[PDB]
Design a protein around this ligand. Structure first.
Ligand SMILES: [K+]
Ligand SMILES: [K+]
Ligand SMILES: [K+]
Ligand SMILES: [Mg+2]
Ligand SMILES: [Mg+2]
Ligand SMILES: [Mg+2]
Length: 35
RNA sequence: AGAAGUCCAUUGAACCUUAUCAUUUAGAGGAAGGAGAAGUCGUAACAAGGUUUCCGUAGGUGAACCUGCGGAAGGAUCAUUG
């Protein structure tokens, strides 16, 4: 079988866990998911 | 013709009583704010200020402040068709 989990993070946890990272002023306007 | 005086009315000063406004003013004591080179205790905010910050509301702690509920990004995320 497979395990399905939807994770919903607050901003602080998302940054600390490195789910998202601080980007440059121009790079934070990019909305497409990473390849 | 006519004075003093006298009678009742009118105008009505001045005074007394009641109350209301306006302008000043005394007051034992209480409690606020501000200013002043080198006071004490912490370190609340500025970096993720080391528990992200802040708004409303409620409660509680020497003090800054902490906590609960809902909210904002002025966030530390403009982003999973994964
Ligand atoms: K704090
Ligand atoms: K902050
Ligand atoms: K004390
Ligand atoms: Mg501090
Ligand atoms: Mg601390
Ligand atoms: Mg803090």
């Amino acid at each position: 079988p497979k395990l399905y989990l939807k994770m919903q993070y607050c901003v602080s946890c998302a940054i600390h866990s490195k789910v998202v990272r601080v980007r440059s002023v121009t790079d934070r306007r990019v909305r497409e998911p990473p390849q």
